[PDB]
Amino acid sequence: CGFQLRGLGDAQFALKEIDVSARNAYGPTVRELKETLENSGVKVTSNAPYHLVLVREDNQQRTVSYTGSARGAEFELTNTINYEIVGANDLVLMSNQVQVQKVYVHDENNLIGSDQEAAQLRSEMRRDLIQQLSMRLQALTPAQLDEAQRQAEAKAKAEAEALRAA
Amino acid sequence: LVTESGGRALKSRSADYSHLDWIPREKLTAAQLAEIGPYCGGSYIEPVRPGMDDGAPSDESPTYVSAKASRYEQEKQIATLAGDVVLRQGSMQVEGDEANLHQLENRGELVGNVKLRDKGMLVVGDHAQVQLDNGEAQVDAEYVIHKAHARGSALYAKRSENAIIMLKDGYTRCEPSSNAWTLKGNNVKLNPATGFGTATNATLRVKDFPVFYTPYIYFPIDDRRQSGFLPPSFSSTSDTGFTLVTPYYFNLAPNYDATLYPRYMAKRGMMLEGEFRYLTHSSEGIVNAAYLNDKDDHREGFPDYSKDRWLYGLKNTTGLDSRWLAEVDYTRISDPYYFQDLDTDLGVGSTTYVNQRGTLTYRGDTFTGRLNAQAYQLATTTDVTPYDRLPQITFDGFLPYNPGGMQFTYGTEFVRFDRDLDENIYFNDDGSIRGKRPDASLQGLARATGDRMHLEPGMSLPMTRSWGYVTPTLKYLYTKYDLDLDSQGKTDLNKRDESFDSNQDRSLPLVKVDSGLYFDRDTTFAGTPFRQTLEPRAMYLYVPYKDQDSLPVFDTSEPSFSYDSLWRENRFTGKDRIGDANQLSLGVTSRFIEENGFERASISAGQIYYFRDRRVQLPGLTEKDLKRLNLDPSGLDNDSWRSPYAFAGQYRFNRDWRINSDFNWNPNTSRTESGSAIFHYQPEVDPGKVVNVGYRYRADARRFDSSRGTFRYGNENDIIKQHDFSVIWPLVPQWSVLARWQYDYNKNRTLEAFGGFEYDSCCWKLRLINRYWLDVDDDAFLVQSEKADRGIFLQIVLKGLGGIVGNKTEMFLDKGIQGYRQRE
C-alpha cells in the first residue's frame, strides 16, 4: 500500500497556453487531443507561445497468427504518432513518438464485420495515444520550455549564424 | 604500371595513393569518419584551396598563376612555365610539372604529374592540352569524385566546343586497392546539358573478369537525377524455379518516384510490374500495376482460372490539410489464384481478398460526415462472397455545450448491403460431384440483402474530479431494415416453419454508468523514481432484451474476450445485433510513470459480472443452433454470472526493448481461452541487433463456418497455438546472421522458417537466405489445403548505384522480422 487520492495539484497542468497543429489538420486524432487538453484547463490558442505539432501518423497492419489452412487469422494494428514541439520562429525544442498496438480476430468469411471491428479498435487506440500524450504534457512546465529554448538558441544562433557572407 | 592496367588505382603514381587525395582511416576527423561506412579503409578528402565554393565563372575572377621558373623558345613560339605550376581561377585549379603555351595555335599543354581540379572533382593524368579559342581539351588518366567516394580511369578523355565529354576505356566505388568490381564502358559520352550519358561496349567486370555485356547503355550524370538501378535478386522457389528480378528506380522528383520490377521466372514467364509513389504536404499515394502471361497451366479447369494474370491498383489519400479528405484503396486482380501463384516475394500470409474502397470525409468542428463506397474482391475460391457497402452515409457528432453541463451526441448511418452469390456446382466427368462453391451453403436470412438505417442519440453527464469520475449516459438506438430475399431463401424459410417479413424495425435504450478512482503512490525501483498509479474502474450497462433472430447479419461480429471487452457498450460490432446487457464490469489499471511522463510499464486486470443471461447471439449460437445434439466446449457460456478473468500488461524500456502480454482465463469451465506474450528487442545504439519472440494462444474465436452457412465457436481446426522467433545478429566484424521460425503447435507443422547470412564490405554486400514456408492454397475441389514451398534468395549489392531505396523483392524480410530497418 501507501497510496492517496490524486490531488488537484497533480491533475492540473503546468501551462495554460498551447497551440496544436497536425499534418491531418482536422482529423479525428488532433480534434480529440484538443478536446482533451482544453478539458484540463489548457487553452488551445493560435497565438500561444509553444506549438505542439503531430507531423506523421502511421497506421500499419501486420499478421501474427495463422489459421489451420495457413491463411491469416489475427491482425495486429499499430498506431504511431510522431510529435515535435516548436517555440518561436519555428525552432524545435523536443521531439518524440508515442505508439500503441492491439490485435483482433479476422474472419475470411465476414469482411465487413472485420473492418468494423478494426475500426472500433483504432478508436480505442486513438484514445490511448492521447492519454499518453497528455500524460507527457502534464509533466512539462512552461519554465522547462523557456530554458530549453534559450539553450536551443544558444546552440543554433551562436554557432550557425557565425557564417554569414564574409 | 605506367598505364591503366585494370582493377586498382595506379600505385606507380604514389605509393599511398596520395595523388587521388586518399587519406587512410586512422588520419580522419570523426566528422569525416561519419561519412564513410564502418568497413571502409579511408576517404577521398579534397585539399582546401581558395575559391572552392565561389562557383567557377569564366572571367569573373583573376587568374592565380604560380611556378618556380619560366622559359621561352623563339623558333616554335612556346612560352613555358617550369617548376611546380599551379593555376587557379575561381573554382577550377590546374597543377602540373611544366606548362607550355603554344602561341602559334592557342594551345596550352601540361606535362608532368597533371592534376585538374574542380569542386569535388579531381583528374590525374600524364598530359593534357586545351585550345583557348573554343573549349576543346584532351587528357591522357584517372579521376576521383570525392562526394560519391567514386574513382575511375580512362585512356583518354576529350571535350568538344558544346561541352560533350568522351572517354575511351572507362567507374567504381571501391577503395584503390579493392579492385573488387568496375564498370567499364569502351566509349563513354557525357552531355552536361540534357544530363544523359551513354556507354558503348558496356561491361560489368569483377576482379578484372567480365560478367556482363551490352553494346549500348543510357544513364543520368547531372548530379543526382531521376534514375538508378537496383541490386538484382536471384531467387529459386518450388513454384517459379530459377528467378531473376532486376528492378530499376526513377527518382522523378523530391516528392515522387517510381520503380519498375521486371521478373523472369523459369516456370512462369516474363512478369512486368511497376509502382509509382508520391507524397506532398496535403496528400500521398501509391499506384501498382503488374502483368504476366503465365506459362504455368497447373491450374487448368480450376474455377475462375485465367491464363493471363494482372493486377492494378491505386491507394491514395488527398486533402489532409482541409476539412475534405478523399481516400481511395482500390485493387483489382485478374483471377482468384493470383497471390497464391505470384506472391513469392512474401511467403507466409498471402491475403485472401483485396480492398476496393473510395471514401469522402468532411470533418467539421462539431460533427463528421462520411460517404464511403466499399467492396472486396476475393483472392480465393473457398470463401463466401462478401457483402459490399455501396453508399454507407455516416454523420457523427455533438452539439456545442456549456462547460459542466449535459453532452448531447448523435450518430446516424444509412447503408445499402448487397452481393451477387456465386453458387455454381462443379461435376466430374462421371455422375458424381466435384466441388461446391461456399455460397451454396447459405440458407434463409443468410441469403438476404438490403438497406439499413440507424439513428443513435444519447446524453451523458460527465461528473469528474481529480480523484476520480462518474459519467452516466443514456442512449437510444433505432434501426430500420428494408430487406430483400431471393425465392431460394424464402422457400428455405417455409421449410423452417418461418416467414419472411421484409420491413423490420428495432428500438432500444441503453443505460451506462462509468465510474473510477485515481490513486498515486511514489516509489523508487532500481534507484529510479517511479510514480506508480492505481486507477480502478467500474461500468454498469443495461440494454433490454429484444429478439433479433429475424435480422440478417451484414457488418456484425463478436470479438474474442479481452480487457477492452469490459468497457464496450456492445459485445458485438456493427449494428446488426445489440447484446442484451444487464451487467457490471470491474477492472483496475496501474501505470508506472517516469519523471518525463513516459509510461514505462502498465498492468490491467478486470472482470465482468453478468446479472442476466446473454440471449441474443449470432446466427448459429442461438436456438437455431445448439440443436446439433450437444453444445460445444465453452460456447454454453450463457447463464454464467461471471466473465473470464482478463489480464494484460506492458513494459517498455526506453525504446530499446518492449514486452507485451495478456491472459484470459475462464473459471466457469476452468480453461484458458486466450493468452499471448510478445517480446521485441532492438537497441538504439546498434539497430543491427534484433530479436522477436512471441507466443499466441486463442481458442475462443467466433468465426463464420464456410460450409455450415452459419457461425461457430469451438473450431478445433483453427485454434491458434503458435510461436514466432526471429533474430538478426552480427557475429564478427563483417558478418551477420538473420533467421526466423514460426511454428503451429495445434497441427504440429512449421508455418515459416528461413535463415541466412549477410556479408558486408566497403564497396559491396552479399545476402543469402534459405527459406521454407506454407502458402495459401486452393485445390481443384474448392478445398483449402497447405502447400509447402521451399526457396533460396540471393542478393549482390554494389554500394553507390542509386540503390539506397527500399526494394520490394525483400518483402518476406520486412514482414517476417519486425526490426528490418538496418540503416547503413
Curated annotation (Swiss-Prot), chain B:
Coiled coil: none annotated. It comes from the Bacteria. GO terms for cellular component: cell outer membrane; transporter complex. Keywords: Cell outer membrane, Membrane, Signal. The keyword Cytoplasm does not apply. It is found in: Cell outer membrane. GO terms for biological process: Gram-negative-bacterium-type cell outer membrane assembly; lipopolysaccharide transport; regulation of polysaccharide biosynthetic process. Together with LptE, is involved in the assembly of lipopolysaccharide (LPS) at the surface of the outer membrane. Component of the lipopolysaccharide transport and assembly complex. Interacts with LptE and LptA. Belongs to the LptD family. This is LPS-assembly protein LptD. It comes from Pseudomonas aeruginosa (strain ATCC 15692 / DSM 22644 / CIP 104116 / JCM 14847 / LMG 12228 / 1C / PRS 101 / PAO1).
